[PDB]
Amino acid sequence: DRPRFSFSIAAREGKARTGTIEMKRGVIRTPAFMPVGTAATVKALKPETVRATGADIILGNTYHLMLRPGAERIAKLGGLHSFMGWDRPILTDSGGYQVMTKQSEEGVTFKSRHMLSPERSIEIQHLLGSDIVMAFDECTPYPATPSRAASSMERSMRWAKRSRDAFDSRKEQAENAALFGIQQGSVFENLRQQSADALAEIGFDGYAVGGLAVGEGQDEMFRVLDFSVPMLPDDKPHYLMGVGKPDDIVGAVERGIDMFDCVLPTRSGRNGQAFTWDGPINIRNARFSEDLKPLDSECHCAVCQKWSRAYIHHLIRAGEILGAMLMTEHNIAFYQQLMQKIRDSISEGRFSQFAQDFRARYFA
Amino acid sequence: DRPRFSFSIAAREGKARTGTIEMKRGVIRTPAFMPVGTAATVKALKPETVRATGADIILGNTYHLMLRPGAERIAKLGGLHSFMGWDRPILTDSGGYQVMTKQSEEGVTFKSRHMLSPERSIEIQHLLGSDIVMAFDECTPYPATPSRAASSMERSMRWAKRSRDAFDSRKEQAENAALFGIQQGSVFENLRQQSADALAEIGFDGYAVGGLAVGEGQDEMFRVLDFSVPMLPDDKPHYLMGVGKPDDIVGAVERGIDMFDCVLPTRSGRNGQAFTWDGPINIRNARFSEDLKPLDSECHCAVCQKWSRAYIHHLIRAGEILGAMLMTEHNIAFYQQLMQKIRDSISEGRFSQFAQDFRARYFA
Numbered sequence: 261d262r263p264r265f266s267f268s269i270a271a272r273e274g275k276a277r278t279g280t281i282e283m284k285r286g287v288i289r290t291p292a293f294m295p296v297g298t299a300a301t302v303k304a305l306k307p308e309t310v311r312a313t314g315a316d317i318i319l320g321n322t323y324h325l326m327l328r329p330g331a332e333r334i335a336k337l338g339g340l341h342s343f344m345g346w347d348r349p350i351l352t353d354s355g356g357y358q359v360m361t362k363q364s365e366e367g368v369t370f371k372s373r374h375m376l377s378p379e380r381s382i383e384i385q386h387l388l389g390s391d392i393v394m395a396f397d398e399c400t401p402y403p404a405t406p407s408r409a410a411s412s413m414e415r416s417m418r419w420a421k422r423s424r425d426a427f428d429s430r431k432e433q434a435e436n437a438a439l440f441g442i443q444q445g446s447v448f449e450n451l452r453q454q455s456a457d458a459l460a461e462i463g464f465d466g467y468a469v470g471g472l473a474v475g476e477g478q479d480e481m482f483r484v485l486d487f488s489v490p491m492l493p494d495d496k497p498h499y500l501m502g503v504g505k506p507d508d509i510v511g512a513v514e515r516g517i518d519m520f521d522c523v524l525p526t527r528s529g530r531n532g533q534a535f536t537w538d539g540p541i542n543i544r545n546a547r548f549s550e551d552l553k554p555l556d557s558e559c560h561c562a563v564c565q566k567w568s569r570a571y572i573h574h575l576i577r578a579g580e581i582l583g584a585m586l587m588t589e590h591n592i593a594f595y596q597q598l599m600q601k602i603r604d605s606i607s608e609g610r611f612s613q614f615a616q617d618f619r620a621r622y623f624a
Numbered sequence: 625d626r627p628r629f630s631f632s633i634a635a636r637e638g639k640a641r642t643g644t645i646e647m648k649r650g651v652i653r654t655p656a657f658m659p660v661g662t663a664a665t666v667k668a669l670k671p672e673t674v675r676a677t678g679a680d681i682i683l684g685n686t687y688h689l690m691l692r693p694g695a696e697r698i699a700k701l702g703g704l705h706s707f708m709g710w711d712r713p714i715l716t717d718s719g720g721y722q723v724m725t726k727q728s729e730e731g732v733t734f735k736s737r738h739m740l741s742p743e744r745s746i747e748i749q750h751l752l753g754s755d756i757v758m759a760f761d762e763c764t765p766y767p768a769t770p771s772r773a774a775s776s777m778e779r780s781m782r783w784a785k786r787s788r789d790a791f792d793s794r795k796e797q798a799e800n801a802a803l804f805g806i807q808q809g810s811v812f813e814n815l816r817q818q819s820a821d822a823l824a825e826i827g828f829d830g831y832a833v834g835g836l837a838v839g840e841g842q843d844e845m846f847r848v849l850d851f852s853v854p855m856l857p858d859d860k861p862h863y864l865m866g867v868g869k870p871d872d873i874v875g876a877v878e879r880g881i882d883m884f885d886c887v888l889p890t891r892s893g894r895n896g897q898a899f900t901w902d903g904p905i906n907i908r909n910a911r912f913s914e915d916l917k918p919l920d921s922e923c924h925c926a927v928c929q930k931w932s933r934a935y936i937h938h939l940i941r942a943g944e945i946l947g948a949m950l951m952t953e954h955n956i957a958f959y960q961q962l963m964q965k966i967r968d969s970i971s972e973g974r975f976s977q978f979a980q981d982f983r984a985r986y987f988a
């Protein structure tokens with residue numbers, strides 16, 4: 261049968277890498293973008309359509325699903341894959357970051373009231389049946405004092421060890437799924453180093469850079485990535501959580517990131533924002549009312565093969581569900597085409613040229 | 625090339641008929657159900673999905689489209705078919721009934737203010753490019769005195785003649801589209817007869833029974849159909865406007881109706897009502913939370929091949945767009961499967977048995 265988790269780097273250019281993760285439910289091409297499910301659905305898209313855009317893996321929202329329908333119910337119904345009709349890999353967040361409430365060394369309590377711990381988070385992700393399980397971590401406020409960022413990071417590292425142990429104690433989970441650790445430490449180099457050291461001493465299948473979708477700005481995000489990603493084991497995937505805009509993704513790949521997730525293409529699609537190679541546009545704008553061109557005249561997606569800006573403009577202005585469907589399909593397809601161009605350009609040793617050409621046009 | 629409008633009856637059983645309408649953009653199998661578009665979209669469905677359910681023709685909403693985007697704009701963009709991506713026949717209502725405001729012999733004025741006349745309605749439907757054009761008629765209140773029903777019907781008949789003349793004066797329209805007249809007369813037999821006589825003296829490609837989606841109850845609707853449908857030319861299609869529930873459709877076919885439209889499968893789908901051969905169910909009900917059966921265990925639609933009641937229950941409770949998509953696809957598919965069973969049973973001389981079996985199970 262297929263491997264549980266096998267990461268292979270096919271090509272490099274500078275700090276950028278391209279390759280594959282082989283898992284039992286399929287292959288993930290990296291750098292990868294994971295569409296975000298909100299409540300066991302990628303908003304407005306059937307799973308076949310998600311796959312048709314090129315997605316290899318989706319993110320399942322543990323925070324939402326643990327309350328309704330609940331993890332035990334989803335397990336009774338056959339697991340999240342069967343429930344939502346997506347048979348390929350699913351990555352689940354741990355839930356602790358989202359819900360952040362009172363915390364302690366045991367875990368986090370939240371509002372009627374509920375308690376999440378590393379052990380309960382691993383069990384919930386087990387019941388959901390996800391393929392990549394995230395360690396249970398804390399949300400560090402931004403800005404944070406060095407001392408508060410330190411205490412938060414060190415609690416997260418103790419929770420990472422407990423996540424590792426709980427995962428390993430469930431033999432079906434350990435045999436069939438993968439476990440990722442999450443680096444914290446806010447914007448402070450020495451804390452990011454201590455966090456990386458702790459995670460590597462525990463050992464994980466992949467390493468996420470956490471705590472950088474906190475509104476700090478791209479310059480500062482890139483600064484932190486500059487010193488943080490090289491601290492992580494080179495031979496394991498690097499996952500930048502909650503990022504981001506297309507230009508964020510390009511710059512983060514240039515700094516060694518292999519995996520991404522963000523609600524932007526789905527959320528902003530329903531709200532009228534379409535991503536294009538010439539930058540984002542708001543299809544609700546009256547300037548599109550008679551525009552017969554597709555959302556993007558170089559996009560390969562099914563929406564751009566069949567419908568005009570003028571039609572989609574009309575649908576969104578009218579509040580029509582089909583408007584949200586077409587905008588979301590195009591935006592996820594655009595993100596997947598971006599990742600494909602990234603992967604191809606690294607494989608061909610032309611990623612620096614691509615990144616320069618991309619930015620010149622996207623921000624023209 | 626293909627015929628403009630050719631209606632053929634293949635088989636009869638009692639007053640029920642089954643056959644085909646051949647038009648330039650395709651064949652319509654009768655008895656037919658037309659999904660209703662709201663604003664150049666069948667809510668929550670791509671045109672390919674509408675076709676996949678079995679639909680041969682859809683209804684376009686003239687009232688909505690004449691305001692936004694406007695008929696002239698849709699024509700500038702290539703017509704309604706190109707605009708929404710549906711290349712098969714479209715029937716458009718005339719708009720007068722919907723908007724009903726002040727009226728006169730010229731037409732109707734409504735709120736900023738606008739005026740619709742028979743000539744303007746035909747022109748709007750021409751600009752949209754529809755295949756079946758409806759004569760411009762009046763909305764009769766229900767209940768109505770005989771005298772008010774008479775004056776309304778006779779104004780509608782004068783408007784039907786003006787609709788005929790305006791249609792015939794546009795040679796591209798007359799060569800490529802069809803024109804249906806609308807019988808009025810409220811619940812009064814003598815007025816229904818005078819209306820039928822007037823429409824037949826003008827001559828139309830098809831004849832609608834208007835004014836029976838006014839809340840009168842099924843018993844009274846069937847009573848009016850009993851004497852009204854035989855007044856219409858036998859050799860032309862009979863269209864019952866705005867009807868209806870599955871049991872309404874079966875009984876109306878038994879009384880000689882060939883065509884139907886209703887917002888029920890789309891509207892009630894988004895609101896949690898699913899049609900099944902055992903009657904309607906509300907998928908939001910907690911009793912479906914762990915039900916792994918499809919919406920209907922005999923339905924052939926793609927939703928029922930892939931997803932459970934429990935999943936769709938979750939989606940609708942969560943407010944998710946995919947919930948509306950799956951409910952609407954199933955409900956339109958159910959309606960199309962109902963029409964297919966009707967057509968097959970008439971063709972096979974088993975429609976009386978079907979109707980009896982249908983009602984026993986649907987209302988068990």
Ligand SMILES: O=c1[nH]c(=O)c2nn[nH]c2[nH]1
Pocket residue numbers: 353354355357358397398442469470471472473501502503
């Ligand atoms: O967007 C984010 N999601 C998470 O689950 C997370 N965990 N740490 N940082 C995070 N950022």
Ligand SMILES: O=c1[nH]c(=O)c2nn[nH]c2[nH]1
Pocket residue numbers: 717718719721722761762806833834835836837865866867
């Ligand atoms: O539902 C209806 N729609 C119409 O357009 C119409 N016209 N007459 N009766 C009608 N009923």
Ligand SMILES: [Zn+2]
Pocket residue numbers: 555556559560561562563564590591593594
């Ligand atoms: Zn596109």
Ligand SMILES: [Zn+2]
Pocket residue numbers: 919920923924925926927928954955957958
């Ligand atoms: Zn179905």
